[PDB]
Amino acid sequence: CKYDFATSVLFTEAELHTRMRGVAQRIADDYSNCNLKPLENPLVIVSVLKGSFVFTADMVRILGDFGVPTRVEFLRRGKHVLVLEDILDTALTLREVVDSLKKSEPASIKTLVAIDKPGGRKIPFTAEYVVADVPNVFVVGYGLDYDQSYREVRDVVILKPSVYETWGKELE
Amino acid sequence: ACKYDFATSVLFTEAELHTRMRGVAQRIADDYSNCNLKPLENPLVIVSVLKGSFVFTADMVRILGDFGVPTRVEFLRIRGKHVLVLEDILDTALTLREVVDSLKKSEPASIKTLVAIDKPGGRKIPFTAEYVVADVPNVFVVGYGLDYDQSYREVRDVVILKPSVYETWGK
Numbered sequence A: 001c002k003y004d005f006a007t008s009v010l011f012t013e014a015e016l017h018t019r020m021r022g023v024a025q026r027i028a029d030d031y032s033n034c035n036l037k038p039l040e041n042p043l044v045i046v047s048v049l050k051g052s053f054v055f056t057a058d059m060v061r062i063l064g065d066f067g068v069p070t071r072v073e074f075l076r077r078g079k080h081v082l083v084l085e086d087i088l089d090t091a092l093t094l095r096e097v098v099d100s101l102k103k104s105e106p107a108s109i110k111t112l113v114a115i116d117k118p119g120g121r122k123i124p125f126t127a128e129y130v131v132a133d134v135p136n137v138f139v140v141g142y143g144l145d146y147d148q149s150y151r152e153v154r155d156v157v158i159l160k161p162s163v164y165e166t167w168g169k170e171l172e
Numbered sequence B: 001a002c003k004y005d006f007a008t009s010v011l012f013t014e015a016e017l018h019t020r021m022r023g024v025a026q027r028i029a030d031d032y033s034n035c036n037l038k039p040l041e042n043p044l045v046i047v048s049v050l051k052g053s054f055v056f057t058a059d060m061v062r063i064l065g066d067f068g069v070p071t072r073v074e075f076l077r078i079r080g081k082h083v084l085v086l087e088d089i090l091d092t093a094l095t096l097r098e099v100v101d102s103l104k105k106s107e108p109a110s111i112k113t114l115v116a117i118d119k120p121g122g123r124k125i126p127f128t129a130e131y132v133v134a135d136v137p138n139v140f141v142v143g144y145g146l147d148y149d150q151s152y153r154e155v156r157d158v159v160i161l162k163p164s165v166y167e168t169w170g171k
């Protein structure tokens, strides 16, 4: 492949940004009757997990270029809150987090994930905004990690078992 | 001269910063090639500080990744490890000192500092960053992680903040 520990590059960096610009136009349309201004009424970004900091940094600057001003917060009333996550697999985290952003009842609350793994659900969750779908394969890159590594990968790729095995007999 | 409204001037852009970051990534590559940096085994621990360094952290770990500097991030808003702290702006250098001191009490292999914006004239205590992306005078800024009350972090460029914005807002 293009990398030396992958078998396939699912989504490149040019694809996600292109998709995130598309979703940004969707969020700019859906949030045009909210009167989104800096300070007074800026959209809130809830950045769950530890691997959502790459997607969050890219998204807040794509929404800003689409006139959708934001204010971020990290979790690792009268406000339209937006929860962001690197990947949506089992969907148990968001559900709790989403249901937990309601106890401080916001103006409105939707979810935005960069990578949706709809095939690995345990409870029926659906995000209003998804940048891309991926089959039930393990994909590192764009902040995603295998034991805290390979987050720095600009692309969403698939780690070769060898990499997962070669690291096996170093642990003990 | 400003490409915005909430600002009087544009000190540095997303393009000015990115080019400066590749040059600092190479030096990070030069000075860390003797440590034998490898994923999982011994990656370069990037300790991101504040809520604002998260932008500068997201772009810098993808430039250090281009030059072959694998990393594992930690956010503080390490034993026998090479730790590299990152912070958006360096002012009084107080916040940096304590974080590094606290980090020093875990005995990391090494430990240096990397900032995107340094305000050398804002020093309460003396402090030198091992790596620096840009220098600004003693003016209040926003953008690229630098915020005005949780706002303006989304600005792609580091800009000086207009006075009207926080005389009107600070009452």
Ligand SMILES: O=c1[nH]c(=O)c2[nH+]cn([C@@H]3O[C@H](COP(=O)(O)O)[C@@H](O)[C@H]3O)c2[nH]1
Residues within 6 Å of the ligand: A087, A088, A089, A090, A091, A092, A093, A137, A138, A139, A140, A141, A143, A144, A145, A146
């Ligand atoms: O790099 C990765 N590529 C993947 O495909 C993947 N799938 C799940 N994870 C791990 O899942 C945890 C949170 O995901 P969920 O809450 O959606 O289960 C996080 O702790 C992740 O480490 C992955 N990490």
Ligand SMILES: O=c1[nH]c(=O)c2[nH+]cn([C@@H]3O[C@H](COP(=O)(O)O)[C@@H](O)[C@H]3O)c2[nH]1
Residues within 6 Å of the ligand: B050, B087, B089, B090, B091, B092, B093, B094, B095, B096, B097, B139, B140, B141, B142, B145, B146, B147, B148
């Ligand atoms: O948005 C901002 N624009 C600025 O120009 C600025 N100067 C100082 N600060 C704040 O002061 C802190 C300095 O921390 P140090 O002790 O490490 O210098 C930083 O971490 C910030 O909290 C700023 N925030």
Ligand SMILES: [Mg+2]
Residues within 6 Å of the ligand: A048, A049, A050, A051, A085, A086, A087
């Ligand atoms: Mg996650």
Ligand SMILES: [Mg+2]
Residues within 6 Å of the ligand: A145, A146, A147, A148
């Ligand atoms: Mg993980």
Ligand SMILES: [Mg+2]
Residues within 6 Å of the ligand: B027, B028, B030, B031
């Ligand atoms: Mg050097």
Ligand SMILES: [Mg+2]
Residues within 6 Å of the ligand: B065, B066, B067, B068
């Ligand atoms: Mg390479």
